[PDB]
Symmetry: D2
Subunit: 393 residues, 4 copies
Amino acid sequence: VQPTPADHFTFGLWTVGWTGADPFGVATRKNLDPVEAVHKLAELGAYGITFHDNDLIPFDATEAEREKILGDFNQALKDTGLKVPMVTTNLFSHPVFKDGGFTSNDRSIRRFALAKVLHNIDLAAEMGAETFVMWGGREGSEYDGSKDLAAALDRMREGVDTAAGYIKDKGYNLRIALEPKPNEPRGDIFLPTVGHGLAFIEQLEHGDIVGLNPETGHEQMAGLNFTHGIAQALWAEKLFHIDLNGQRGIKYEQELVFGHGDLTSAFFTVDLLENGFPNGGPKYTGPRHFDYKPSRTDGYDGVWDSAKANMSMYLLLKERALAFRADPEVQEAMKTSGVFELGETTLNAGESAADLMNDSASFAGFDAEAAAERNFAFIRLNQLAIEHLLGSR
Amino acid sequence: VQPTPADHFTFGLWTVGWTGADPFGVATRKNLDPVEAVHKLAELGAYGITFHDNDLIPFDATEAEREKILGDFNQALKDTGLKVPMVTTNLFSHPVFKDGGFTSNDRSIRRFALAKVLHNIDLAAEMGAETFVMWGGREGSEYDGSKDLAAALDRMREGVDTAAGYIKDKGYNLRIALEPKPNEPRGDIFLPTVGHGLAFIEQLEHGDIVGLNPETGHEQMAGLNFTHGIAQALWAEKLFHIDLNGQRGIKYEQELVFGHGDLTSAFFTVDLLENGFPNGGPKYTGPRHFDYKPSRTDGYDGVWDSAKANMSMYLLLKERALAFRADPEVQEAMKTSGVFELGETTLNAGESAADLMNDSASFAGFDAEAAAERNFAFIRLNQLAIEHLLGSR
Amino acid sequence: VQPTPADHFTFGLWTVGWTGADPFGVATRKNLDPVEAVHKLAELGAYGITFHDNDLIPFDATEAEREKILGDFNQALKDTGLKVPMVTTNLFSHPVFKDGGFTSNDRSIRRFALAKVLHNIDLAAEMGAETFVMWGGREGSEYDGSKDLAAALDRMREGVDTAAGYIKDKGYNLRIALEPKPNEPRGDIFLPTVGHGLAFIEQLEHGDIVGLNPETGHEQMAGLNFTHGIAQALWAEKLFHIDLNGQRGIKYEQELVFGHGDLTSAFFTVDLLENGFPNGGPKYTGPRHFDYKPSRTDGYDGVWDSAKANMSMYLLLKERALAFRADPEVQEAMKTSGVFELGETTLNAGESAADLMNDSASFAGFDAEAAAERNFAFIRLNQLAIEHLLGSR
Amino acid sequence: VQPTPADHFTFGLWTVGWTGADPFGVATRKNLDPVEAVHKLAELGAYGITFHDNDLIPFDATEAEREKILGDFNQALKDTGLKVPMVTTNLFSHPVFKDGGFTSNDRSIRRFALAKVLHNIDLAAEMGAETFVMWGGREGSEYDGSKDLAAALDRMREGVDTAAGYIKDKGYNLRIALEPKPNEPRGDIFLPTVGHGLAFIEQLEHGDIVGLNPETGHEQMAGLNFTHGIAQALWAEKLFHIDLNGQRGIKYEQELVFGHGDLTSAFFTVDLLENGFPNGGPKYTGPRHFDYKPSRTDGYDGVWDSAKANMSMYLLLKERALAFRADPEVQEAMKTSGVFELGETTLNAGESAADLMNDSASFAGFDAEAAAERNFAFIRLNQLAIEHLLGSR
Ligand SMILES: OC[C@@H](O)[C@H](O)[C@@H](O)CO
Ligand SMILES: OC[C@@H](O)[C@H](O)[C@@H](O)CO
Ligand SMILES: OC[C@H](O)C(O)[C@@H](O)CO
Ligand SMILES: OC[C@H](O)C(O)[C@@H](O)CO
Ligand SMILES: [Al+3]
Ligand SMILES: [Al+3]
Ligand SMILES: [Al+3]
Ligand SMILES: [Al+3]
Ligand SMILES: [Al+3]
Ligand SMILES: [Al+3]
Ligand SMILES: [Al+3]
Ligand SMILES: [Al+3]
């Protein structure tokens, strides 16, 4: 399997650009030149690149520095043909953000964080980005009494709605995508999971242009099922973007290569992305963005290898997912388990609650005993799924 | 601390009625008479009782049996003065529900589960219940390919948005409240957490009368912060009911006495329930319902002791929560940490995104370095919180 | 892949015999005749069968009942040719064991539990079993103050170091193997993991004949790495037996089909079992025992399918594990990562601590900077591993 | 409660010296002068201080720098009167240790790591330390195939035994204490828990002087019960040292103030440390060492406050633990639950397995039914425990 930009694979400048500094150690790799990264990724078959405002332009950059960086970067893009489908703001690294940006207890910091975002929205617009991601890594708490939970959600809404209103006023072809995370760095991050993110969006005045940007590792740190999460986001029509990576359990965020964490889950995630829902429905058209980090034990060759690995893993899983669903045995297995039967409405055409209630066959004279004897055969269906993933059947 | 019905403490018939049967053993206690339970609870200071349709009337009960049970039960209620603030349906114990009720792949089972619910709504109405809870214990899967995730959410919506319409047509003073859980008896249960529940509610046609019924142990099984969860539910004005209990980690549902799991979390949960939000806002008025199980190692005396314990724990935590907030030192500590400052809007009165952007003091000439030096003193605030909980002040 | 008794696959009578009763529901299947089970398993290609004393002979069985059961069972074994490599006692189902067997606070219960075990040792001897497993499911606590932790470990030692002495005195060709578990049905079970089990064994007087019987799902419920666990058990030469199954996260014991939980982990577990250690060392010769439960949603066909699935999964993973190591590219990748280099002793032949200390090249004049530049290429090695698992090479 | 050196509270130079740099951000505080730290801690009531070799002397320090640092430090110690009960080596921060020290696949790195340790042993000896801690943070893997698990345990044993042999040859009054940790930084760290540590110690040639140094947060990251862990370590007589801190769940290591994580667990941990075991047994005499980090949101005042908090928390919990056990009601509650009964040997004086087997009253004619009716009253005992912790009874 050889990737092409058609596949729409994208990488964050910070993924391959990660030098290795972690909680208990220093960087293990030298810095990666943004122009070099753009050229290497292009060479690898990537479709686009993403970045935080500060991945490209340093926090303390002067106008001449900002100008030369952007200049070089834009020339690199024009040469390679790489796209910039998504941009995001860094509201977590600088010490000023120690208590968050949008929900920092300090008001001047909140104003600064929002202004930083508004400016980044202009850059994204110039970059031609289609999605503006927001990952509130610092919005949370270690202690329960450090925040007025209601106020926090208000300040969060204020920032997001202000940003969204700005996009609307400027007429930018942009959409904001929130990225939930349970914990880390924060002990408890606000809007910890996909569901909390979706619900929050319903309280926004400009919710029409705000969606989600779920992450495999993020939902898994909460012990939840990622495929199920994105499925609900797709169902709600809020799956604006997606971050793919690997996580091996409820622990610190590993951000491994996609498919290097929960393999079977990864297989089913791609199945959903590529095949959509069995009884029909919407499909995700956005970019297949990888948000991982090359393990600090490896050198630059390993870095480029991990970039390839992400795309290979996806392409391999994809083949198996398509063959999986194409298998006639899988089709009959699906029928037997009632997969398509679930697609049938419970109530009959034009039937009301009262009608159902007074339908003896459905309740009073219903044989729940015989009904309970149905063999759903869910285990066999799963065995066929796994065999396809292994490349047996 | 001695509880009174004024406190509005309620218990499920199934809590104290649990005989001890678990996954690896049989029941360790005898059959708790529902009339005896009503009398004992009344005696203990409880305000009301709750139950699954089958806790009271057996699945295979004949009309004469149903009539004598309800008759005795109603007389018990009239004597004791106990209220029945909430009722719920049992869509998990009978083998027919092995693949769920509302989202069972089998259509006839879905119809039966819904009819069972519609009938239970009439009973709740007669019982004078105010809330109708729904815990989709069996709605989920062990394998990812067993369900069409979109269809499942459709069938789920159909059921609720079937039930809710019925309530409206009948003119019942009832509100549906969903009881989210990450997993068990299922591997992955649909709408695993508060957030997923809130978001789901936004896709309903009759969402105006559907809310949540969060549980301490349920959110904790996902490793999430319960206080934060209910806070978001309160903020969204969807906190219709609440199940209080104890959970000691991410494992099977222990359903311990409230305060017997995460103590500090429990303290802050009550703080929120009693004190509400620091900068003002809504407060929970519903019943303080305990949904636990007396450990199978204990006999009936232990059962009645655990019932008392729940109320004692709450009343003890309550005193400490009130004293906590009443402490002048805690007030100044809250000021220093910026708890009230968070209650201030980021933007100024009538200020726009553009104004903020072009405010040099807020961005261009902003001193993020000096700003970063603020000592939020979150640790000291937490120490004062804990000292109050310990009765040290 | 078609299994044969040569593979030495064994199943517990209770695995396929599980009727579906779980914490929140009743049994979904009928009574599996032990003779039928023996015949079906034989037919499936199983090498042997295992069982709890009560799986075969009921707790309240009379002599005539015991005699007819054993009689029929032995005839079934003689016909099929199935072996009984392992037997275990049921010290968890009966209400008398609500607070454990060996560590129950009640002394008469401890004596009864031990006597029950001593008798079961005679049966195992007659069955020709080689391993006597012990899963202290009820040995633990929900509350910290319920037990004197030192005394508990003493009573635990007394029981084993009572049983082991008995085996020795009788001259039985048996070895005890402990089945560690973090929790359930208990909140906290004594000797929660492989390590605690191994350490405990070192305090026993008859530790020479006591080992471990690790379980995939058990170690995973603690979030630990199973392959790493058995590796340490193998290293310590205490891997007497093994229970294989699937677990999808830190939650209740799912006991899924082997390979139906953490797929990549399963692959590496088999790799270790079949290939052993790269630089040489001991290998596990015992039976490949499956300790799972056919999901309650499925009927008897599903039951027999799950039995096949376990063996298929193992055989499929096995092929991929052998091919994995046989791959020349994998061999060079292993060399580059230093897999064999780790097999080299740190100190030189006859070198002492003092010599090392005063070796400038190793410390004083050591270039830790250049040394830090080594590309271990651990990511690429993992990619090759996964590609083999997927049947991509 | 006001702490004094009599209490034997110790802090690591790196605890209060932590500037705030974490995975997703930079340091938030200025550097703490080691001499200032020694003076402040003395002032606070601390008994001693601990440090990694590099906390005090930088990796790239020249002889003159090393000499002036140690000189100033020793004068500070002599002035304040602070002791240095424990010293440890830093085998995780420098990039050379990216794949571990003792178990690094690279042999020259293993030799360097061991030499670094041997030299640190001399320093500890000069510092008058009594315990030499070893926390193998980098010894592990992200991928299963990166290491030969047997070889890894061999290299680990080689380093520890070489170090221990050195101590013996030099005649140093030192004892090595291993510090297990599940994961982080490493995805999977070797000897992840107390049990694995204890078991490993039994394979060592110089195990007589090697013990454990458990950490609250470390065992909790594995979801295990800390009190139970140290209890087994005490029982095995391997509790050489202890690291106290707070952890709120299975996630990244928070290293909060002791008592700021799991409160009830903390209470029972101190209960064990202070009260020992109910039926008698050994007690921990070592230092009460705090290994935490002042939250990066706080300034230096917060730092000093957190130092006080640790000692206050312990002293507060201590009072409640003593009063708890002193309470006559608690004594009778303990009797009823059988806490002291567990201290009774199962077998009678001079009784054998055979005697027990043939004791009808203990098996054949044993009434397991009546026996099963005992009310252990474990819930009430826990309620009394919690009430003491809250300061009610
Ligand atoms: O976890 C079990 C659930 O909480 C139920 O008992 C609900 O209270 C109502 O169905
Ligand atoms: O988790 C349940 C345990 O694994 C048992 O079933 C053992 O196999 C033997 O008692
Ligand atoms: O700005 C958010 C980025 O996409 C990531 O670095 C986060 O997901 C970290 O988890
Ligand atoms: O050298 C080990 C120290 O005691 C700590 O910093 C570790 O526990 C980190 O978890
Ligand atoms: Al991301
Ligand atoms: Al991320
Ligand atoms: Al409930
Ligand atoms: Al519940
Ligand atoms: Al088992
Ligand atoms: Al098991
Ligand atoms: Al430490
Ligand atoms: Al630590």
